[PDB]
Amino acid sequence: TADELVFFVNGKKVVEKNADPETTLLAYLRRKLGLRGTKLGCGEGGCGACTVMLSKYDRLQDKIIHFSANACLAPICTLHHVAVTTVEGIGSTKTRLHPVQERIAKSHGSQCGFCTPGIVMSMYTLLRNQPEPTVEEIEDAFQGNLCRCTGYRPILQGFRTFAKPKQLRFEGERVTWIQASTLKELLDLKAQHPEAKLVVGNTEIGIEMKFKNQLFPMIICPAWIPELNAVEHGPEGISFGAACALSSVEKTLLEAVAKLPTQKTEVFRGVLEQLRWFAGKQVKSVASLGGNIITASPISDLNPVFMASGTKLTIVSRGTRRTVPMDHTFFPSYRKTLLGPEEILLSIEIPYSREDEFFSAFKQASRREDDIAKVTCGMRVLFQPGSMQVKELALCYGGMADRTISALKTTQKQLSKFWNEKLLQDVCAGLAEELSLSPDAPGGMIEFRRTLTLSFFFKFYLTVLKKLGDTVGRPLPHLAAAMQASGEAVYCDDIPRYENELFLRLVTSTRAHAKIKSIDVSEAQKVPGFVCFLSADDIPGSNETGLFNDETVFAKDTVTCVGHIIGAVVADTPEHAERAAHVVKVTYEDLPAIITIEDAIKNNSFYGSELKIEKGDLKKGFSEADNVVSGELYIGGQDHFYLETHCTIAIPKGEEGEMELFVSTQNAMKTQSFVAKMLGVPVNRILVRVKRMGGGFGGKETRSTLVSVAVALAAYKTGHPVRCMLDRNEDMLITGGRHPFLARYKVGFMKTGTIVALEVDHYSNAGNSRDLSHSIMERALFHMDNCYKIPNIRGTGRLCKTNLSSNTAFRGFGGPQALFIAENWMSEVAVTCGLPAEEVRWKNMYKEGDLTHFNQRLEGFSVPRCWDECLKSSQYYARKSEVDKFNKENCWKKRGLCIIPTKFGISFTVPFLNQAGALIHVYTDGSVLVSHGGTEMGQGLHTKMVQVASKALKIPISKIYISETSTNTVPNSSPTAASVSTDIYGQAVYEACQTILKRLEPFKKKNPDGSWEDWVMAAYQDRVSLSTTGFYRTPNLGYSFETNSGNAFHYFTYGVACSEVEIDCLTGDHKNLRTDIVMDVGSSLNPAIDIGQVEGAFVQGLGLFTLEELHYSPEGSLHTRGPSTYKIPAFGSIPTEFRVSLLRDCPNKKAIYASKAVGEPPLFLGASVFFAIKDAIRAARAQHTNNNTKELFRLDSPATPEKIRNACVDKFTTLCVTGAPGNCK
Amino acid sequence: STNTVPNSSPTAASVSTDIYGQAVYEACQTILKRLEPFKKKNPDGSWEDWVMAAYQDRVSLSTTGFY
Amino acid sequence: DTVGRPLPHLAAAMQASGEAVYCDDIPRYE
């Protein structure tokens, strides 16, 4: 009794007879229509990997329009008579690439490639609306698109070349969906069924259903109704039907602002400001005005502005019609509006501003919670005619309570007062009082939020006043780049499903530390297509897993973090597995939990004892020092945010325990080992294949196996192929991240700035198993010197054992942590001594031939030339002057500049992992297939390996090919890690080539003018084998702690970065203005790959140090589980000027063709933004705080807007502006 | 498979046991040459021991063989 | 050392059970 759903994809008609309202367009494209170019990266609207173009008729506005949307939030039931275009839709390597696809690929804009299709579709959509866009439009187009690899620079450079009706009924398994064609039909429907839920854009509802497990068994979509879509210019303001997209609201209001007089458009420009950095295009194209309003989020950016301005709401039910201005009574409680259950919001009139009426809007440049504690506001003042005397005042704030509120007491007291200093004082006092937060108020950041309520008003108060009075060495693009841009590159979940293939959903601990009392599955057993539930009892081999045999495959008697895997559900579709998992009832008995580093130090909960490197005589160095500074420092962790999350397919053959797996991993050997150990089967039975990863970053070196083992078990149990791909929220919760570090330190120095003694005790938060924590701590200790000679030095480290997901490798592997701790105390030495930072860093540098604190010698120490050249090209000394000039001429905005070096040790710190295998075949057509132990994750290792094989063999690259990595071609491989993959695999590929060349030598002698093909065929026919292994092992490695000698590293990669920032001292926001990097990568095999690596790495570092903040409940539950609450760098995050140079004339005698590892060494240079920011904070504190020029103030990482703001101590932070006593002129 | 062993003659002429027998034997010998130093250090050890030790000493445990 | 021993075909038990995979026994993609 349901109507047929009919739409179009890439021009082809789709007729769906049994359309289920719960089906997203992304699930239908990938799993019904076999178009896998469009990706899942989050499922929540933040990342854009799932972008498509939608095309539909506005009957009203009378035209076919083209917009971008997130496929992951679009229900197919909204798509009746809509046309969809995917990346497959605009071109292909099979036919011919669209110019967009080709350009992103040739410009080096694609590394891993997983983001590239979403991005191609964002750019494609812009070009169909505007065939000649500006650079601003291009940039805005990419707002809702995230990339983890590239640093964005190349995509923008690349694309800059372009610049300058009857009711329908659908019936699902749970949901009945009605598409309403008329207003009348809506009201009747709402009257027959008051509980029925409206859905328009689905960008809120979709999240409630997916993430918060709500189920609305009746949905009415009223998007077709003309009255819900009208735009009407009236004499009071501009009315918008409640279904109007935010993009349409924005279009109209911008048209009104350019046309009408300034004085009429104050409200309008408020709405526009709130809409600026609001999601991206894909969301604004689908999100309705009315949906935002009725959602009534405490952190709605719109509702404070509508409340402040008395925006009119026309509200309707069958019979009833009424218009009210939005005021404080509109939101009576949490997520509620003053509407009756029958009632629906019809339109919204956004008023013109009057004479003597002024408006501002502001929002907090940070969000850390799903729906609370992000400050946002609309402010309105109306004066008596021609005067400065207050007649009306409205200050309405989100994120200061569980609903949008208005500061009524405060504003009331201002009536008839004049707009002056006293007024400012009275309002700030009102505000601090009326909006006061108890110290344990949900959301935290109490100080920062109070200070923002007041600083926002100060901006309004100042604004109102103003209103009155051989290819080696060649820039070869990634070999997969084109197919990555075309959506043709295969990633693990792009592999077709077998007819009998099943799906797995992890079942996860909701408690930090607890006994498992019972597990009940009877409600999961009722989900359609449930196959089975798996737990510890089902394992045929061993439940003992992990790098140090201290983990369970499945939890047994207790759980030890939130996300501790307990079991798994297997079902016939992934939605079925997802549903049935959320319904598995687990009964717990809480145990005492240990969460923070501090919790752990106080309870002595550690893995092992302290590690230590010590050299010199500390109680003596401190004797000789003129100056001794002690302190404590914290650095928060980081999520990998690989655009492709964890994924495994396991295929049980049914013979002799055989299993073939396809997996998103850096470590095929351990995946194989772990799978076999769990199964109780020899390693020779198990085959693991890796084509590519859509990102790794250290996060798929070991923790990939959490999914793999589980999936393989389901494959063993059921005997069907099984697969699982993690959602983003699962991925961030279970798989662990970068290690948070705590440091307590003490430096002894002279008045010159010469260091003479250092001790640092480092503590990492290692989480609920060992994993790579110990080696991570070792690498931290090897780097606590950065580039500096320290005669007397003691570094300890301790691994904190905690009820958190087990943390793991992350690009840098403990290095960034200790290098940051190191740049910190260096910064305090320069300030304390009253000398320029760059003079202090310079004087304390190692020289050629110096020995580290672990006694390794530094030969080819290139930091001096990197430094000298970075100073020169960045015009450092001139710009420094200009920063001082800026800071003397500006009160509430400050600039900051910093230049900082890096040294990063190259090799695995466990000697045995510095080995590598290759396997080379030459077929009788001369075509060569290379296989080696490395995996491709976007860093372009295969491209480099192709380039090396080609040089070595003296044949064009076109004759060489690499397909994939597999455990049956090269066994016992180390993980693709520690930046050495190009060194060690290149060497082994090189040896295999040499072996093949020596074998062809005699056929070469017999026919010196012969082609390669002739020689190969002559050697085949003479029965000379054309297949060989190659092998390499890094010589002279083996550091000893007990003797503190022998080489920990093969060589060191060096670099230097300069960064300039401007902070907003009233809000803690900042802009990255300019960064110059000079990097020593020896002689590069591929300048483009290597510059790509410097850039991507630098921007992952600037994330770590400034933007990325993970946040947990006191009970240890991760709160930031997606792009909405966790902020990785975005297109608009990178420095306006971003220059990277590779040092000329510096070959490396240690590695393949004089090249140097580049993957991880440049990530630390990201910290130049942090220390530039801190430099800006110093000037802000010299401005408003005190007069001590040598003041050491602590600043932890990440320097978010909260920490930057709270550190700009002033009359607001202190509350002196209220008339109180505090600290500040 | 063609990605493990390439350019193979068809399984024919009754010679397979003969020629692949020799090719398997030769590869087995190369392994034993590589494992001999670890045998001599620990004559009372197991197969498993010699293998782990060779791996940890970064000796390749993969080889081709040919006849 | 089994050379010269009448050891049964290694795959013979799976062949008798239906378990030994022949080309058409490989499952089809959807």
Ligand SMILES: Cc1cc2nc3c(=O)[nH]c(=O)nc-3n(C[C@H](O)[C@H](O)[C@H](O)COP(=O)(O)OP(=O)(O)OC[C@H]3O[C@@H](n4cnc5c(N)ncnc54)[C@H](O)[C@@H]3O)c2cc1C
């Ligand atoms: C990635 C992303 C970023 C975002 N960023 C921001 C941001 O920065 N600032 C901000 O304020 N918001 C932000 N949002 C929230 C977003 O603006 C809202 O989700 C959106 O406006 C809701 O409209 P919709 O049409 O999708 O509503 P739906 O999800 O379809 O419905 C939302 C709710 O409104 C009800 N409803 C809808 N229309 C009516 C009607 N006319 N009458 C009565 N009830 C109705 C529905 O029943 C439902 O309860 C963001 C959302 C996403 C996904």
Ligand code: XAX
């Ligand atoms: N685009 C892209 N670039 C990337 C990676 C990625 O996933 N995607 N990851 C890093 C890491 S993190 Mo680690 O030591 O396992 S902590 S080392 C490492 C490095 C591994 O690649 P080689 O340079 O050895 O070939 O690649 C870097 N560059």
Ligand SMILES: O=C(O)c1ccccc1O
């Ligand atoms: O020393 C390293 O950099 C390292 C990296 C990955 C795994 C183990 C290790 O010792």
Ligand code: FES
């Ligand atoms: S997957 Fe749709 S926005 Fe991330």
Ligand code: FES
């Ligand atoms: S290339 Fe953009 S996420 Fe990897």
Ligand SMILES: [Ca+2]
């Ligand atoms: Ca750990």
